[PDB]
Ligand binder design. Sequence first.
Ligand SMILES: *[C@@H]1O[C@H](CO)[C@@H](O[C@@H]2O[C@H](CO)[C@@H](O)[C@H](O)[C@H]2NC(C)=O)[C@H](O)[C@H]1NC(C)=O
Lengths: 367, 912, 642
Amino acid sequence: CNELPPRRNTEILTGSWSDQTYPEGTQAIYKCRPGYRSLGNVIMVCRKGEWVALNPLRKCQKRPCGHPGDTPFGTFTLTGGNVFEYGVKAVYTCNEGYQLLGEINYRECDTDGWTNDIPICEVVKCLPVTAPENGKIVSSAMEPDREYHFGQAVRFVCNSGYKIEGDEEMHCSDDGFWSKEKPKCVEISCKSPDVINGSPISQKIIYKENERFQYKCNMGYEYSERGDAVCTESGWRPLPSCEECGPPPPIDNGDITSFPLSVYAPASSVEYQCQNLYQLEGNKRITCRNGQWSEPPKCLHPCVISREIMENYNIALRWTAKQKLYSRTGESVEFVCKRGYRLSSRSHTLRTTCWDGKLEYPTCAKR
Amino acid sequence: DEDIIAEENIVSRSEFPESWLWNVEDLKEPPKNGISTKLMNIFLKDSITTWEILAVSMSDKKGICVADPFEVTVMQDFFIDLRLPYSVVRNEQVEIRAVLYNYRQNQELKVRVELLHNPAFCSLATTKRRHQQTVTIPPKSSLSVPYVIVPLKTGLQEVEVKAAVYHHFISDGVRKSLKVVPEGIRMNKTVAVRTLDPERLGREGVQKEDIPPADLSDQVPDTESETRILLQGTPVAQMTEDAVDAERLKHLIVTPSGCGEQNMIGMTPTVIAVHYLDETEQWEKFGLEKRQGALELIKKGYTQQLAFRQPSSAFAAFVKRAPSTWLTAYVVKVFSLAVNLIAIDSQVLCGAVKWLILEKQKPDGVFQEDAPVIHQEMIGGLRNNNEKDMALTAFVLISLQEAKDICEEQVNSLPGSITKAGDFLEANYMNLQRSYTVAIAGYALAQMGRLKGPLLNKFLTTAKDKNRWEDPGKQLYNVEATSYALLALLQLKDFDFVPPVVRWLNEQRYYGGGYGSTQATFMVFQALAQYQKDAPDHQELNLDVSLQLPSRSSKITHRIHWESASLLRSEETKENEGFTVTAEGKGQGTLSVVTMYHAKAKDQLTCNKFDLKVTIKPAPETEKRPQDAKNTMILEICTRYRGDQDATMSILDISMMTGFAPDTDDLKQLANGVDRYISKYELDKAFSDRNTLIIYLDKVSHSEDDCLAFKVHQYFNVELIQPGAVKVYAYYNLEESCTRFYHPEKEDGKLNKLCRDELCRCAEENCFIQKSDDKVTLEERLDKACEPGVDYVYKTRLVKVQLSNDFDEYIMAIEQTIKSGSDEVQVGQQRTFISPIKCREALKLEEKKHYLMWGLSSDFWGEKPNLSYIIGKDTWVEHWPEEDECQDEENQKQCQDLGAFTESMVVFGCPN
Amino acid sequence: SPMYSIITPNILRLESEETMVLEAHDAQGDVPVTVTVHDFPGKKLVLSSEKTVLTPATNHMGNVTFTIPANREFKSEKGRNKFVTVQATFGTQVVEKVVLVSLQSGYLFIQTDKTIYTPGSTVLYRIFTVNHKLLPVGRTVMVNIENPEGIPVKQDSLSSQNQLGVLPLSWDIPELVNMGQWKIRAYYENSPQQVFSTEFEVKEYVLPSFEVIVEPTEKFYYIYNEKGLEVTITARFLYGKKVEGTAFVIFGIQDGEQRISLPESLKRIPIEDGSGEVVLSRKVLLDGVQNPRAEDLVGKSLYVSATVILHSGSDMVQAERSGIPIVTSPYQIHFTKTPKYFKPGMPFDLMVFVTNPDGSPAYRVPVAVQGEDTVQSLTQGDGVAKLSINTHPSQKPLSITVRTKKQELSEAEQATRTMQALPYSTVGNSNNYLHLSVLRTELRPGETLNVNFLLRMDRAHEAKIRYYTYLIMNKGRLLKAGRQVREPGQDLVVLPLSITTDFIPSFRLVAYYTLIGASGQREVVADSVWVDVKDSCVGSLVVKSGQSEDRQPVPGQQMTLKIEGDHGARVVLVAVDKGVFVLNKKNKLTQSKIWDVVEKADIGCTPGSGKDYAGVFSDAGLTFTSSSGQQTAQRAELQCPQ
Ligand SMILES: *[C@@H]1O[C@H](CO)[C@@H](O[C@@H]2O[C@H](CO)[C@@H](O)[C@H](O)[C@H]2NC(C)=O)[C@H](O)[C@H]1NC(C)=O
């Protein structure tokens, strides 16, 4: 032959090859280029006037890379082929809820082996959550402010006297953010109920916890089981149901003789009554004149005569009915010195009159 | 090599998962007759077996469906089955088997199999030479290739075997891992068991437990241990007293009838019964349907009581009778406790309250009964004339505070009146004598929070035996009094005094009903119903337990809560340390410190149930040109069962030495009767590729050794002959077995290794550095002995040769220190050079002769008092001619080179 | 004259859609109905409130569908049962009933990737979250990992939302771990009393290279069979090819928990082409036990142990086959499918359930009643035969004895069982009975079953019966309710019931009629029957080859998998080596086990009928309550009675 053996596409030369023309029978050994495999060396031979192939069957095939290996919480797919040969690319993808750590997501079968390392999938994580004001976190699993991961659910429960405001439960969602917003704990409060076929008895509109709401039913309707509602963190339990000038001012030691109502309008009137033995001063009936109530009366204070105070003054009741005696405003009480006592220096009378809770006790200073 | 795939181009199979393909796919394709087909591409693993694929679908409209298993077998024509045990013991010589399978129909295969070298193992495979064998596997057949290895270091180590066939493009590789385990036996010691209770056993609310480090006296050298700190919570149910049985209340359901007083006497048991069964939730045993009628009766009683409501919003036994204070107050009481059951009119309740304040309350503040009730048995403890003012005030006051939340909006004088009543009870509370009055006034004042100081003290000291407020008279008065006191203790939150009171009440077995039970029926069930309400279901558990290890930078904390009290909280530490545990909070727990380690074993580790002796001897006589082959030896195997009786059917698993095969005639003679059996499959196999053998025994004696023997011929020749092995066991248990090795040279078939304590190094490398002294120059000697690796270069004289059964010792005198390293040996001192017996003939070291020896620092073996040298693969050993020998012309080259070597090393040394 | 009646399931479940049927018999015009559900006994909350109108065009029969929210209030002090008050109001009349409540939110199914695991590996498991209709739902589930001792070692609280009812989780097994049966325990957050479990064994092992199957010729051993117990040993590699070797077989007798090995029965046989045979002779069996009376061995079982060794001697596999009953009869008769109450004078139907000693159904087995050779039926594919007898009008207890009449079998080996049925007590001894009969045949979705309503009563009020009210119970909830028009004079009417996929696995049909008869008393007569349906998936899911069958896979080779299932369905997969199953094949998730859990959570407790008309409703999981006062007793048992 009058040349060198042609440089094949998948083979390489091994000899020096410095001469120009080569005699007959010379064997040209072709080495298997990197990333290829064969049973032996592919040998070429020059005869007549061309470089023939002594081993037509022996050929260099693509080198087999091993199984690229599966990573936890992730699958892979093959690119540019269907066999683990030299020149393919195994692209990895993490499962739902798992994010890739690093920047290399492929493995390329090269002449030496699989390029880079097997990718690693980490579970996405949500920011830690703090306990809301006037509330706690009953759920989760221990550890104050530990980073939650995909899936874990969190529940919120307020303390006593507070009700929740917002979504009750949540969970670490797919994008590493919580599924719902952080709620709030507001003091338990209730509005005035709109009772159907009824009218409210009470005056107050805003209610706190465990406060009861009294109501009456319109004519033709009656109470459905219960006759009142209670303010709870969930609302009015049970719910009110009927099935088929302002209030007068308060006075000390007394009330009105009728059930109070909400509005009176001009020309209305109410009567007052004092507690037992208390004495009333003023007009016993008040009247609404031009959106204002007339002057309500007052209850004068009666005097209580205790044996404890009479013993200190060495005095006793003349007509012994106890040990204790009450005297209304204006009533007079007659005392006598105990046996062996005299009217004392700072006394003048044994008969004194009670005036709005003030009674002058006589003293006896022992003769 | 010709016509075979090179070793470096074979990628061994390594993916052998027991389970895989844990994937999720959705069927989104356009349905065809309701079925949507999805073609899914999968990558098979390296295992050669059958996979069972199970499918489960979840549809919005169809639900869950578990498909039938779909089996997919994966196979090859030619493959390696590398049979590895789960674990092996460090430094113990074991044999593994690689079984080569050829499943081609009509093509035999010439195969070359190689065991890759691994520094963590000891085998004939080294870094320098390979371990190959060329076998022929007939079609539709298999062949077993034994490899003998010795695990050197613990942990997850790797075994890799490759194979390639001649004249074909067919290769396979297997790379598996096994666990190497310390020699000792798995042990654990219970270091500490401590009870955690900060509120009970701790100082200032914190409890510190000091844990001592574990004993670890019998710990196997060079083995690790793990100490576990196990925290758990102790949940404690707090013993709520048992509620009164529902059957014992069947009689309290009474139809109310009569007049102003007889109606309330019949209404009392029913109202309080529903109130109790409602709270204790016992309508299940009583009868759910019955509760409806029970309500109608309460309504009935209420409606009938409205008929006696005088226009003054008061109440009396009869419409003409003067209004009674106590009766009106009691109607308020009952009606206030029944608002949660039926429809109670506010005007009725609040009107009665406004009446009592304005008409029967004096200035001082005390209630007066101006018309005593006609039934004096419905008032209970108030009959006892003493301290009527204090008692009646307390009664009426309690009815007011119970109807506060309902009649505080309508009645405006209520708070002031409650306050006035409270003043009188406060002022003359300490001058009480009757236990009953102290009890009823105590609950009237505890509702306001005005029962403190000496008053609270008198309330507590008036209770005889700390569990009952008892006063001479009827027992019903005492039951009422103790009920009031229990309601007061439930108001004062004094749960330390409540259990004794409640227990005494339940022991009375008083279920209400009867002549004059009114007060005693209402009060005892109101107090018990409130007791089951305030009763708190479990003792609070909230433990904060913080560990403190010296080897940890921060603090490991654990929050033991009630909802997760039983969760075992484990924290592991590899160092055997003493540490401090600090617990704080309410509740109880348990701490268990348990340290796992490796303990030396007195008891025999191998051959516990069988004795096995294996001998290999040169066979005598020998004939001429028949037989089977040349070089013949005799294998003798003697076994005895270590039991009380004979062993049953047993197995002899014999692996040949590389190049040997049993004699057919001897096997046919053993197989005939004599309680032995060798299958025809074995007897039919040719002389070639019969390197494994199984002799079946019908029984083996326990009294003495049962011995057999047969001749083995060498058909193949190899430079390195691998030891064969024999493994005896009983058919019913493979674990209780014994394995012995045989090698004609090497006694006890063991490979060459140097062991001390528990660290063994391989000694199956080249005997020394063999080269051809002509090819060696002065530069060659200078370049090698100047390498940084070479630690010592000595001119020595062999003083004495101590021959031993395992390793030969060469006592050398350091004549000259050409280069010194770690060992600071002086001229004149002696050092011992150790070497394997296989090398004794190859070294030919004679006494009174001299040698140039240099070696690595890795060839040291001992401790400074007895520091010895190992003649390894990198140990230069050249004979040094004597001065009279250097005058000769044959030794001229070596003498000139050696003299120059010494001079250059001494004067110039290594350039660097 | 108008009578108002409500029917609601015996037990009401939370977060599940429950139906309530409303009827206004003998009424005219439109009847406004408002149904409210309150808690018991406080009536604190209105759990539901729906409205409807009963018009004559709908025969004064309507339904109200409601779902009760799982409030955190319905959680007691633990232990007591929770109840609700169901209150239906028609015009002036109000009818209320107290119904038991179950806390069960639905079902949880756990699937572990394997059945046994080595220390160090990770356990991958999925939790399927459905409701009582097996439809995927989104709720919060609590998971607990538990060691063999019982101590929980890992808690968690996750959500099933946006997961299509499948929740993939994992737990790492430490290297140092306690061997034995571990458990996973999950429960819905709302229902902590219903805890679903799956076990997985932890053990040190290696996968075998072949499988050994020990299968006796018969599934039992006849005590007087002189041949003895003949056993076939089948060994084959995990990749299909057969096994050549030697097998050591040994027999033993098991009595309860006492095992007695038989040393004399040990045999060594050649395994040629993967198969061998070894017989335990009757003589050796009798000599091993120290009792000459062979009759005493009946009731005990046999176990077989076989050890196979390859010719290479590199692998060994031990396998066992236990639980082989020593019996005197090849069959076993069960009355677990036949109602235990009859209607005097009417034909009584029996559902005989014949099984093999191992519990499997027996196909084509002749059964007959003693003294009535004419009443001889044949078992179906499920081993269920139908036997109809004729009852005389009487109050005497009907005692039935069924025997097998398999020809070619002696009378000493024929199986026998004895049952008893009680008379259906009638309202005021009026002798008014109703009898429902159904063609006994494996029923499949997509067919039609003819339900025969047969009436028996005096002619003084037979014309008054103008319609029947029929109800269907499936999966423990009311599936369908309707009317069956009956003309005066007709004794038998036929109901064409269309069977769809919503009836799997079985349903109860309970029908009743009401009238004013005899002494002007309001009377209700009822009757129920249980019908089995072919257990299967609602849809379908098949996995097959997505390539040419001739092509065998190769280690590492890409392959195509053809998956054909329901449109839109999310399918979860797993590939497991069959070697794993050779060591442990328990707790494997199948479809038969799903329907097993469903059928075990049923609120019905009887095959059919009851002692009275109230017993019929209660035993079929229903509560009836009329305005006139005829109502069923309360139910305070979540679980059926013994
Ligand atoms: C480690 O601690 C355990 C405590 O759980 C000890 O108990 C052993 O465990 C086996 C269970 O296989 C029990 O039957 C015995 O109580 C113990 N067996 C032995 C051989 O001691 C034991 O000290 C350690 N566990 C093991 C498996 O050795």
